[model samples]
Structure formats: structure tokens, C-alpha cells
Target: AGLNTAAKAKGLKYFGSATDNPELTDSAYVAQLSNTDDFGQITPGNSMKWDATEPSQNSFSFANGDAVVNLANKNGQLMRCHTLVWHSQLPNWVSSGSWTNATLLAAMKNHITNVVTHYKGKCYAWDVVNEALNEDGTFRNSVFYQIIGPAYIPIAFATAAAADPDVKLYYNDYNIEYSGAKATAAQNIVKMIKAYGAKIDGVGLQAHFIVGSTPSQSDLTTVLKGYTALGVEVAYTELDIRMQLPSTAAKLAQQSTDFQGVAAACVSTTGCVGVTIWDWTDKYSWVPSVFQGYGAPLPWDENYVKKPAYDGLMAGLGA
Candidate 1:
């Protein structure tokens, strides 16, 4: 059994993993994903994002996104919609050119509404806005912000709500699980957007943690509780605890202990319901691509072998 089975044994909702479109075609890789009994939830890494869905203005492509949904449904796995709006990985038309408030606002609304409406009732929740806030608790001066101002944040949620009234909406970002500026900014953004009474449901703490650098267990619990105070559930949406590579048994053991700490925090804090690892296996991990000489952030290794971290997750779930 895997993390999802273990989580259910503890009466938790979903212990998910993020996998991408490219990995779906390989039978060996897809085997893990097909195990709904073990892995109950799936998050498509990049298929449902802005660039993949709509590379150009007013032209929507649902092929890749639909494949994810179809596969999840076939296996009865819960699907989490990745993102409706993010500042990065955007296409040229939306990112490079200058746009007025009127044009950008309309474009944002149309894109959000159309995409959400198309996937309505097929996925569990969406990251409606991602990484839009600066560490100092202010909006990032991206083209979206410069053109549409802070109103864009509120409207994005509103538009998604109108498209799928019942689906849960979220604001997802990294580095919000610890205390300090980014956390404060996330808190403010949640408060600010919820002021409109839109259907913002939860906060996604993209737990891109490292071995020694991750926040302490106490800090993780505190932040989870704090976000839930705003009347929304909190979840670990993209979890991966990486370490500088030498691949020692000691480091792996510590990572397992750290993984359990976060899981224990979620179990203790009722608001944190789901825990989705960035990828289940290091074979497909995004770590090496971005981090120089750093690797192995997942519970499984390249050969689909369960590492020490996976045992820690089961222990954390009390399986």
C-alpha cells in the first residue's frame, strides 16, 4: 500500500502525488498512478496551467488537460485542478505586450471562466491565483498587476466562482508555511481577497522544503492553524523535501523524520486535509533540473523503489 491508503486508514481525505503529462504515456510510470487504492488523488504538474491550456489569447486547448481528467476518472482517483492564473510560464501575448486595464481584465475573466467551466465537476479544487504576492506583503508588479491592479486578484476568484459555484478555489504559493514576510503577505492576501466574500476555499502551501531548511514541526502546525482561522482548509499541494546530494542513509532517515513531522502537523491540525507530494518517485522529479547538484525530494526512488521517506509517511499516517 502507498501513502493514500495509509492516509485513509487514518481517516484522512487524500494523500496525493503530482505527475505530469509526459510521464502518463509510459506504462511503468503510469502503473503507480493507476493505483487508486493506494494513491487516491492526482495533481497534473503543468498540463492545466495557463500556457498549456491557452497558449494564445482566445484560443483554448483542452487535449492535455482532458487526458489527465479522463485517466483520473478511469481509475477513480480524485483530481485537483492545478491553476487558473499564475504569473509565470505564460505565453508571449499575455506576458510580453503591453495591455490596458480594460483589455487585460476582460482577458483574465474570459480565460478563468472558460477554463473553470469546462472542467466543472471533474476536479476537486483549483489554485486560482499563484505566487502573485511579493515577500513584503504586496502584489507583484507583473503585467497582470500593472495593468489590472489589485482588483485582478479579487476578480479572478470571482470569475472562477461564477464558472463553478460549488468547486473549491485556492490561493497557492511557496514559502508561506513559515513565519516572516512571505507568510505575512500570504495572510494579508487571503484576508484581502476573502473580503469580497468570494468562494475562496483553501490555501496551498507548496511544501518545497529541504532537509535542514524546512520549518520546524511546531512552525508547520502553527501556520496551518493560522490559515484555517480564515475559514478555509489548508493543504500541502506540492511537497518535496530535498537535500544536497550524497544520498547517505543518515540524510534519508532525517528526511523521513522531517516528512513525518509535517504529516503529524497536518493530522494534528484538522484544517490541513490533503498532502500531495510533488512527485512520488525521484525518476521524474523536477529537482535536478532546477537545483544544481541537489536531488531526491520524493518518497520513491528512480526504480519505483520505496525509500525511507515512504516508510516515514506511513508511520506519520499511523498506518
Candidate 2:
């Protein structure tokens, strides 16, 4: 009885985790990650990103992303390919290039078409566009947004769709889990792209939440419903409930409850396909690096021991 097994038993797609290529080198970590019962899907956290895929303009490399896809195939896990277009991890050429609308859109299309086409049959879904909006519902002033405006999103989607019509294309972002300005902005993406005749299969709510501050199951369900109502599916793409650390027993207990609420929310939602934690173990967690004092955001602790949050997630999945 593991997370993915429990998830499927409850009618959800899979319980998954994101993994970077570097982490795969650790045999112990790969042992846990390769567990079929625990994870039915895998998302390459960094290898599939723009910088990793295309380091230079037009010269693309698939080695790193291919390695990840190979691992997923070997593990019998579905691959949810990340990021055709994102503001972060961009190569110097793409990020620093001076471009007019014509040049930028062409560049965007080229990147999406090549990358999505390369991963054609391998990925179940691609985050076609990622984190394009600000916390206040406005577009982020990335090079894509500044020069090409909102049209950059639809163009990327259209290019991806043309390259690989079968694979699902998604718009992924953080802090859009609950109904508010940020969530509304994400909804508008579905609307905007659809109106432009571009495909938008799903919207990924990057559920990077704080432990005690995580939303109730009902609230999460309602928010998910908002996206699904737009005729697109929803998923918790990058979930991790981090806490201010020094690791108190009491906080771990609350974190356990928070994890349960998230799983329960997805299980209860109609079109909420799956839940994918950022990573399974805290050993590779990005929380501590990003937030100085925050750590222990995963179901497994740094030592790969199952934490209370794991039990909470299993309980929520009815394992």
C-alpha cells in the first residue's frame, strides 16, 4: 500500500513526484523514487526546462530530458513534461536577446515546436507556459511578456499543439490554488488561449504552501472546480508544504493534517487529475535553499524516513 496505489483506488490518476537529473545519481533516492506502488508518474523538475533543453538559439539538446524520460519509462511511470515556455532558467540568448514582436514570437514558436516535438510521444503533458502572471493578476515582465505581450502565451500553445497534438498542454503557476486574483489570472489564461483557438488542456496550481496556513479541503476543492468549470482539467503540479524550521513535533503534526487536506481535496474534486509533490524526500527539497530557515516540506525526511505527513497523505488516500 503506497501513495499511487491508494490514489488509483480512489479514482485519481497517480501520486507523483518531481525529480531533477542530479538527484537520480543517488542510488538510495532512486530506490524509493522507482517504487511503482508509490509513484505512477514523474515530472522532470529541471532537465525539461528551456535552458536545459535549448542552451543556444536553435541548437537544442535532449540528453538530460531524455535521461529523465528513460528513467520514467524504466520505472513504469507516466512522464508529465515540464515547461516549454517560462521566465526562469532561460539561456542568455533567449533572456537577453533584444527582440521586436516578430523576432520574439518566432523564437518562442521555434522553441516550443522543437522541444514539444522532441518529447512527442514520451510526455503525457507539457507545461506549455509557466508562471507568466504576477501575484496581483498582471502579467510578469519577463522578456516574453514585455515584447510580445499576452499573445506570447497563445502563440506558445499553438506551436506546441501543432508539434504534438496528442500531448496535453498546460499553463502552470504558483499561488493559484485558492480563489483570488492570482487564481483569476490563471483562469484568464485558459480563457485567453481558448479564445485564440489555441489548446489549453489543463491548468496546474503549483501548491507551494506553508504548513499551518494551507487551505481547507473544501476551499481547495472549490478552487479546483473554478478551473475545471472552464472545461479544462486541473492538477496540483508542484506541491510542497514547507514549515519554519528547527522542527517542532507540534508543527509536524499540523503539517501532517495539511498534507491530508491537500490529498483529500484532490480526491474530492471532479476533474482534479493528480497530486505531484515537488519531491518525495526533504533531502532534495528546494525549500531550505530558497527560504533560509524553512525545510522539511516533503513526506519523507532528509534521511528518507517516512514522516507524519506521509501517514497523513496515506490516510487521505485511504491506503
Candidate 3:
């Protein structure tokens, strides 16, 4: 059968998930996902990351992650492994570990080794490091920072590469689409990755946009061009155009324009692969749950009905 149809309809080469329903079996989700044209591109939201996949020190559990991988394999989906390293979403043991720099490094190495090796050949891309830089062009003060310092990123990438040399590695961050401290930091991080002679394939810009409240289109386009100029592909990862809730017609309309602009940039750019909305449906969105009074930040409304952004994306994709 062809890949996920919805993804294909959007002209998207990628569609992702551990499973949209966190409660379902991997096999079932895969079976259902197999019918779609874009089902071939699978990315783990939380399942493949350090926190969710392995919660404790030296104790890794791949049950949930395995489910995702198995499903993807059965369905011929191209898996994208999300995040071997990140500042947020780490287990308590990792944050509270009483280890020296060497020990911490060893732990980091071990984690990457086990996880990447487990599904070594399955993943097409691996987000080797995520959100390691601060918005101010410095390293974030993560537990990894407190313990092993800046070397953590390079070490993680190296370990991941060693385990699965074929997989493309990426550095992922939010708010790197505009020129500012965040963007500068991301550039520096990419530079560092390149210096290591490692295979840094792309940058995942988590464009979590707010309605009428994000960087200008021109500014974002310039940034995208800059990244591609550096010989790295760019993807609008975790994209969403949100607003303060109690949705208004005006806000929705503005969101439509914003979404269109982003899609247009991606479609027009040579190295821009495709856009991935954080969640296609609002019912499962992370926006409202994380921030009160904020919801409906994607192309689909709560009922899975197409919103203005959906139409805007269709137009932007020239569909």
C-alpha cells in the first residue's frame, strides 16, 4: 500500500508519531497509519527521547519506543529518532546523579549507545541534540551542563554516529527561525557540530508560532536561507500558529496568513524539506495543557475539521 494519504495530500514527504493515541498498541497504530501516503515518515514525539525511553540510570526501557519502531518497520515508514540529548524532560535520576565528569560522560555515552543501537538501521534521521543552547547564545544550564559541560553535545553526536552511521543527525531547537540570541546560539551549535567532522544533516526549527505574534515572514525567510546557505537542510519542525484562547475570527484569520507564509517559504526554498505541524488536531495539542488560555494552534480545529490554516497551507503548497 502507499504511505499515509493525509501526508501525501499535503505534499508532505513526512508524517510522524509514536502513535497519535498514546494509549494504543504500536501494531494497531501502524496498521491504521499504513493507509496514509505520508505514513512512511515517522518521528517519535516523546517515545525515542532520553526521558521517555529511559527514565532511570542504567535502566533503559524500549517497550514503548519498540512499539513505535516495530510499527514503522511493518508499515515501511522512515523513522526519525527524536532527541538523544536535551535540557528538558530528563528523568530525576539523571538530573540528580552524583557522578564525576567522566562518569556523567560515560552515562551519556551508554544511553546513546543502547538507544541508537537498539533501532540502529531503522531510523532515517536522529535528532542527536536538542535545545542545548540558551536563547542568549550560550549553553543552557541543563543538568548535563552542570555535570559534564559543553562536551556533552559532541559526545552524544559521536556516540550516536558510532552506533548508527547511516542515520542522518540533526540539532533541534525552538525559536531559531529569527535573528536573535536564540538564532545565534543555534548557528554556533551547528558550527560546532560541523567542526567535529560528524554528519550533521539538518536543523529542525521548532516553529511554535503565535498568531500575529511571531517574527516577520521576511525575517524568517532570511534565516532559513542562511541555514541552507551553510549546506544544511532546514525543516519547520513542531510548527503551530497559536493564540490566546476563546478563539476569535480575527485571530484565526491572522493565523491563516501566518501559516501560509511559512508554508510558502518551505515550498519555495530549495533546501527546505517540508513542514510538520506539532499536532494536526487541537484535542491532543500540547499548547493548552502546558499554557492555560492557549489552544487551537494548528491547521485543524478541535473536531478534526480543517481550519483556516489548513486552507492556507493548501494554497501555500499550491494544491
Candidate 4:
């Protein structure tokens, strides 16, 4: 087995993108990926979300999403539908115009219905809402909050359930590693959903970290325990440990330790089911370009060489 396939063999689930590929129609890559047993699950990084799938009010596209779904089906991998609602990456029409509570609610409902129904039985989970809270644990000043208030979460969850009752629904976000304002906000949101008797199945923590800046294994254990205490499954959804500079051997070793810490935490926890690296390889990582002056954050280096992070994860999983 390859590095990723080896990790899966040790019971670690995988998550990766659908939209980053400029050509999912490539027969070679598709065939290679289909035969790889590395990934037990797949997520369409940004393709299935609102902005990429439907940029215009009346215009909807599924070509990209279809490619991913077809690939997943061929490989017998469980599909994870990323984000039914989020404040960022929204199309201009969605964020530009002023919308009343009723209008905003209607739009939210329609988007969830169309997207979820389209993939109904194929998807194993859906990020019903994402990044709704700020670092301070307060509701972010998003258009959704401005119009529909905090109630938008339950509304989105309800709509998803209505469209496809069988699929698991999740609330995804970043900065939820330990007990803090952000973690509090996530806990409260989960409480509200359960209070409303909604079937919220999971919480997705976008565990993006710096090479030497990741939380210790103990901290990660606490965070996972806190969320699981709320009776919801947890996933390290967009995990990546980045580093700044010319990428030295020391930094690579630290990245490995960080990944091992994460894997160890997951192995120690009963509720933690999976860890999904945001991008599989450094060549395709979103950090370097977006953050500037920072690069080489994932397990595979730019040349697809397995770094220390890869070896560390393998060891952590006892592969």
C-alpha cells in the first residue's frame, strides 16, 4: 500500500477534494485513484458548496460535483458533501442584495434542498453549516446572521434532513481545537440543534495547523472529548500542518510529530472517527499562495515525496 493506503489500513479514514482537479475526466488519474484503497471517504473540497455549484441565483451547475460522485461510486468510497451553508465564498448575488428574513430563509432552504436532494443517498455526510462563529465564540457578522439570526443553523439542518433523512449532517468550522470561545460556540450550536430535536450527526473541526504550532496530544484529547460529550461524532475535517520558509529537515520532522499527535488523539478517542488532510500534497496546498511566505504543510512534499509527517502518521497508526 502507498502511504495513504497504509494509513487507511491502520483504520484511519481519508478526506480530500473534488474541485481542485482541473480535470477529473483524466482517465489515468481516475483509474489510479479508483484502484487505491487509501481513502475510505471523500469530500468535494469546494466544489459541492454554494459558490462553486451555483454562482448565480438561477444558474446551477453539477458537472464538477458529478465527476467527483462518479469517481467515489466507482471506488466504493463514502462521499462527504461539504458545506450546505457558509458566509464566505458566497456568490455576489447572495451577499450583495439586502434580503429580509423570509427571503434569506427561502434562499437557504432552496439551496439545501436542491443540493442535498441531488446527491441524496450517495452522500454519507453533509456540512450543514460552516464557520458561523468568530474566534471570540460570538456569532460572526455574516449576512445570514444579519438577516435570519442564529436560527439559520436549525433551519439549514432541518432542510437537509427534509431533503435526505438518511444522510448525516455536520456543522464545520476552524479554531475548535481546545476549550475556548470558538469551542464554546460550537458546543452551544450543537446544543441548540439537539434542543430542536434535529438530527445533527457530526461536528467538523477544520484542523489547519502550523508545523510546530499544533496543540499537544493532551489538548486535542480534551477538545475531542468535549465535543463527543455533546453526543455527536467528531472529525478532523480540513487538517494540515504548515511551516514557513525553505523547508528544512527539522521542520519536516516537527510536521511529522504534529501529525502523529493528531493520529494518536484520534486513536485514543472513541468518538473521533477520521482525520482529513486539507490537501494531500504540498504542490496543491492552499496555504502557500493564500498565506504568503509559507509552504510545505502536508504529508507529501511538492514532488509527492513522503515527508516526516507521512512517516509519523504511519507510526501513530501502527501501520
Candidate 5:
């Protein structure tokens, strides 16, 4: 049994990976992704974001998003649709718009509605709002927060729910998988959404960990429980334990154990649904491009060979 098979046996949903249009053209990558035993779910890395979907005011496009959805559908994989609202990848039109709260709110609703409605029954979950908090437990000064304040979060979720009542709506962020300011702030986000009468079904801890510094399985479980205790499901939405470059065998082994801990944590946590590797292979990993000299952060090697991390994940799921 592979990761997804083992995960399902543990009462978890699926083991997933992120992919994008650029990577889809590679035959080997597509083959690996289409293998349902290892990966039962897929998330588009960037296609569903605001810039890709609605680049200009009221000018919507779904070719890239639809291409991804089509691939997932063909592969019989669950689509974990990413990012309805985020600060970074916004089109210049929306990010630089001269607008008041009223206008921005309308734009937010329109974007949410169109995107959610287009993929209505296809998505297993939607990241309705993402990464809105600063490390110090304060709201990031995103245009959404700057204009609409924290109200943008609830409004985004509300709009998504209105568009697709059945799909799970999640607030996703990084740096919330462990205890401390960011995690506490994420808990408060759950609270705030609940208080606003929004339908927040899940919280996504983007467990982007460093190889040797990953939290213990016990600690990870506790943190996930903290989120679930607030009456919402939880998931490690974008997990990738990246190491510094020129990785040694020892570092790779450490990364394997790190992967094990995260998978084990999700399996042990009651409401933690599943875990998604940011992407499953080093060749397509975003770590190198984003963080210079940091790469090889996935279960698959650059050449599609399974790394020690693969065995670690399988063992974590009791394969």
C-alpha cells in the first residue's frame, strides 16, 4: 500500500500533493501524480488564485484552473481547490485598485462567487481565506485587511458557502502548525469566523517545516487538537519539510522522520482530515525558487525515485 491507501485505512481521507499547469506537461510528473494509490488528492499550486482566475476587473478566466480540475477528475483524485482570497498573487487591478470598503467587498464577493460556482461540486475543500495574519498574531496589512479589515475573512467564507453549500470552506495559513503567536492567532480566526456566523468548516495549517526542526508528533497532534477543539476540522494543507541545500544522507534521513511525524500527527488527531505535500517531487518543488539554496523537500527525488521520506510516510500511516 502507498500513502493514500495507508491513510484511508487509518480513517483519514487521502494523501495529497500540489501541482500546476507548467509541471503537468512533463510525462513522468503526470504519471506519478496520476497514481492514485500514493496520491488520492490534488491541489493546483497557483492556477486558482486571483491573478490566474480573474486578472482584470470583471474579466474572468478558468482555462488554467479547469485544466487542473480536469486532470484531477481524470485521475479520480479529490481536488483540494486552493486560495480564493490571498494577499500575494493578486492581479494588479485588485491589488492597486483605488477603492473603499464597499467597492472592495463587492469585488471580493464577485471573485469568490465566480470561482466557487465554477468548481461547485468538484472541490473537496476550498481555501476560502489564506495567510491573513502576521507572525506576531496581528492581522497582516493586506489590502483586504487595510480596507475591509478582518471582516474580509468572514465575508469571503460566506461568499464561498453561498456559491457551493456542500464544499468545505477553510481558512489556510502557514506557521500555525505549532504553538505560539501564529497558532494562537489562527485559533482566534476560527473564533472570529464563528462569531460572524460564517460557515468555516476547516482550518489549514500549512506545515512548511524545516527538516531537523520539525515539531514532535505529540506536539503536532496537540496543536491540531487545539484547532479542532474550537469546533472546526483541521488539515496540514501545504506540508514540505525542506532542508538546506547540498543535503547529506543524514539530513535526508532526518527529513524522513520529520515527514513521519507530520503524517502521524494528522492520523492521530481526530478532526485533522489529511496532509498534502506542497508538491511530491524535488524537481517541481517551490523551495528552490523561493528560498535560495534550499531544495529537495519532497518524498520523490528529482528523477521520480521515492526517497526515504516515502517509507517514513508509509510507516506513519501503518502501511
Candidate 6:
């Protein structure tokens, strides 16, 4: 058994990885991703996101997204449909327009309904709303917040629940693993949704990390427990550990240790659901492009060989 089977043995849903459309044709990368034994779940890194799904209002496209979904289906791996309502990556029409509350809310509801219904039964879960919080725990004043004033929060999840009742619904965010105001604010949002009996199911922490700087195992556990206490399963979503610049063997091992610490934290927690590597390999990792002198954030190196990070995660998962 590999990571997927290993995580499953502990009652978790998946040991997953995120992929994108551009990487679909890479023979070696696809080989690793298609194996259910290596990864039990797949998240289309950008295909299922708002921009890719609906490049323009009322004109939706699923060809590229479906290609990845088809891979998941053919390989017998479960899927996590990525973001439904996010502030970033909006097209010009949605982002730049000066819209009223009713207009914005209607557009949001329409997008949520159509997108969720399109992938209805195929996905194990959906990120109903994503990265909606500020560092201090206040809602970011995006167009959704400016016009809708947090009204879109419930509306997004409610519409998704109606569209695909069986699929898990989640509000995904970053930096909520610590006992910070952001974490509390997210928990409060979960509370609001549950109070209204919205079909909320899970919470995703975008556990993108800097090497040697992640939270302690105990701290990570507390964060998951916080969400679980609010009655939602927690997932370490979009996980990647990046080191500073030209990665040496030492930095790679530190990255592995960082990954293992969180894996152990997730496994030891009851409400922890799954973990997903952002790109799964350094070749396609966004770190190098995004952060100068920083790359090598995934378990597989550019050549498709498993790094020490792989074995580290295996040990953490009790494989």
C-alpha cells in the first residue's frame, strides 16, 4: 500500500495531490498522478476554479476541467472540486464592474448553481467559498463583500448545497492553523452557516508552508480541533513546503520533516479528513516562478523520482 492506502487505513478519505491542465500531457507526471495507490484523490489545481470555469458571465466552459476529471475517473481516484466563489482570478466583467448588491448576489448565485450542478455527483467535495478572510480575521472587502456584505457567504454555500447535496461543502482559507483571530473568524463563519442549517460539511486550510517555519504538531492539531469543535471536518488542502533558493539535500530533508510534522498532526486528529500536495512535484511547482530563489516544494523532484519527502510522509502516515 502507498500513501493513499496508508492514509485510508487510518480512516481518512484521501492522500491527494493537485494538478493542472497544462501538465496533463506530461507522460511521466500523469503516470504518477493516475496511480490510485500513490494518490487516492485529485484536485484540478486551476481548472475547477472560477476563472477557468466561467471566463465570462453566463458563458461557461468545462472542456479542460473535464479532461482532468476524466483522468480521475479513469484512475478510480476521488476528487475535490476546487473554488466556487473566490475574489481573485475574476474576469474583467465581474471584477471591474461597479455592481449593486442585488446584481452581484444574483451573479454569484448563478455561478455557484451552474458550476456545482455541472460536477454534481462526480466530486467528493467543493470549496464553496475560499480565502474570504483578512489577516486580522475581518472579511476582505472584495466586490462580493463591498456590495453583498457577507450575504454572499451563505448564498454561495446554500446554492451549492441545493445543486449538489451529496458533495461536501467547504470554506477554504490560509493561515488559520494558529489560534489567531483569522481562525476564530473562520470558525464563527462556520457557526453562522450551521445555525441556518446550510449544507456545510468541511473546512480547508491552505497549508502552504515555508521550510523550517511551520507550526508545531501540537499547534496544527489545535487548529484542526478548533474547526472540528465547530462541527466541520478539516483538511490540509493545497499543501507544499518550499525551501530558500537552490535547494540542497539538507533543505530537501527539512522540507520532508516539515511535511511529515503536519501529516502526523492530521492523522492524529479525529476530524482531519485528507491532505493534498499543491503540485506534487517541483518541476511544475509555482514556487520557483512566484518566489525568486525559492522552489522545490513538492515530494517528487523534477525528474519524477520520489524524494525523501515521500518516505517522510510514508512514515508519518504509518505506511
How do the residues 240-304 of candidate 6 rate in per-residue lDDT, one tens digit apiece? 98888777888888888888888999999998989988978889998887788878888899998
Estimate the TM-score of every prediction.
Answer: 0.97, 0.99, 0.89, 0.93, 0.99, 0.97
C-alpha root-mean-square deviation, candidate 2: 0.8
Q: Candidate 4's error at 254, in angstroms?
A: 0.3
Model 2: how far residue 86 lies from native, Å? 0.7
lDDT of 4 by residue, 1-319 (tens): 5535655655655534332455456554455345445456667777887988788875787887877787788778777888889988899989997899998898888988998988899887899999999899999989998998888989899899999999888999999887688998898999998888777988888888888888899998898889899898888888888898889989989999998998788767777777777756677688987888888988877665678887887777667
Give the alpha carbon lDDT tens digit for every residue of 86-124 in model 5: 999999998789999999999999999999999999999
In model 5, the clashing pairs are none
Residue 135 lDDT (model 1): 74
lDDT for residue 90 in candidate 5, whole number 0-100 = 98
Q: Which ten residues in a row have the lowest lDDT in candidate 4?
A: 14-23
lDDT of 2 by residue, 93-177 (tens): 9878989999988888999889988998998889999999999999999999999999999989989999999998899999899
Model 6: lDDT to the true structure: 0.88
Model 5 residue 72 lDDT score:
92
lDDT of 1 by residue, 1-319 (tens): 7778778766668998888989998898898878775688888899999899888999999999999888888888888998988888888889886788998898889999889999999878899999987877678888888888887888999899999998888999998988878888887778888897666888999999998677888999999988999888999999999989988999899899989888878887887878999989999999999999889888989899889998888888877
Off by over 4 Å in 2: none
List candidate 6 segments past 4 Å from native.
none
**Model 4 lDDT on a 0 to 1 scale:** 0.80
Segments in model 1 whose C-alpha atoms lie over 4 Å from true places: none
lDDT of each: 0.87, 0.92, 0.75, 0.80, 0.92, 0.88
Q: In model 3, which runs have C-alpha deviations exceeding 4 angstroms?
A: 1-12, 15-40
